[PDB]
């Protein structure tokens, strides 16, 4: 996260770290959506241009974390993966369309002050909150600058951007399964996701029921925190029928 700040303890209790078993290293962010299911970006698990194609046994998830590098004894919980599910129409060839994946845990995780699931949006919450200018929150342990790495989880609040502005900022083809966020050059404030924040959640707090909803997944951007560029997020609601199908079937 570029130009963010240290998270408060328990501020994002749904934040998950995807961790490579060997060598031991951070791979991506992710989010807890129930006691057995974790949501992430497909490109965290499968990206052939970079020779990335992880299997379940390659990975662990670490839940309840604050420190990036410490083993947070008596606080974090570490889970093995039973199965990975990648969207069948995830487009890794072109533009990361439908950049979404689910991971089922081998055993349910116990909730605590530090471990708690986020909500997924219904149609009405999505329609009401996914509006240009409305701000969400992005969290992660990724790089602090494009060109280093944080001691603890970072957080930044960012406004959703009008779709024509998103489209005019890039040569990559945008789809209805994406939205973009970030400040404009003339707005002064800045901030962005960066490498290592992939797969983490873009959340909004509903003013109707005071619950946090995950509207987006950190997906792609050109650089980090560049003027006139924006970060792109998987549109969770647009893909919720697939999420429901997977969870119901498995």
């Amino acid at each position: 996260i570029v130009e963010g700040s240290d998270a408060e303890i328990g501020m994002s209790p749904w934040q998950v770290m995807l961790f490579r078993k060997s060598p031991q290293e951070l791979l991506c962010g992710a989010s807890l959506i129930s006691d057995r299911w974790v949501l992430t970006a497909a490109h965290c698990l499968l990206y052939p241009p970079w020779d990335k194609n992880f299997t379940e046994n390659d990975l662990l998830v670490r839940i309840g974390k604050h420190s990036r590098t410490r083993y947070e004894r008596n606080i974090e919980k570490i889970s093995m993966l039973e199965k990975i599910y990648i969207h069948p129409r995830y487009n890794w060839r072109e533009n990361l369309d439908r950049d979404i994946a689910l991971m089922k845990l081998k055993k349910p995780v116990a909730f605590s002050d530090y471990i708690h699931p986020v909500c997924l949006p219904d149609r009405e919450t999505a329609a009401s909150l996914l509006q240009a200018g409305y701000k969400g929150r992005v969290t992660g342990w990724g790089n602090l600058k494009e060109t280093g790495q944080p001691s603890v989880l970072q957080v930044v609040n960012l406004p959703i951007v009008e779709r024509p502005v998103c489209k005019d900022s890039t040569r990559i083809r945008i789809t209805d399964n994406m939205f973009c966020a970030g400040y404009k050059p003339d707005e002064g404030k800045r901030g962005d996701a960066c490498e290592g924040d992939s797969g983490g959640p873009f959340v909004m707090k509903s003013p109707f029921n005071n619950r946090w909803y995950q509207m987006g997944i950190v997906s792609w951007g050109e650089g980090c925190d560049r003027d006139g560029k924006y970060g792109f997020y998987t549109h969770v609601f647009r893909l919720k029928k697939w999420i429901q199908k997977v969870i119901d079937q498995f």
Binding site: F19, Q24, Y71, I78
Partner: peptide, 11 residues
């Protein structure tokens, strides 16, 4: 760079 995690999770 990372603190070693308990061996139980790597078995």
């Amino acid at each position: 760079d990372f603190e070693e995690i308990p061996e139980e999770y790597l078995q």
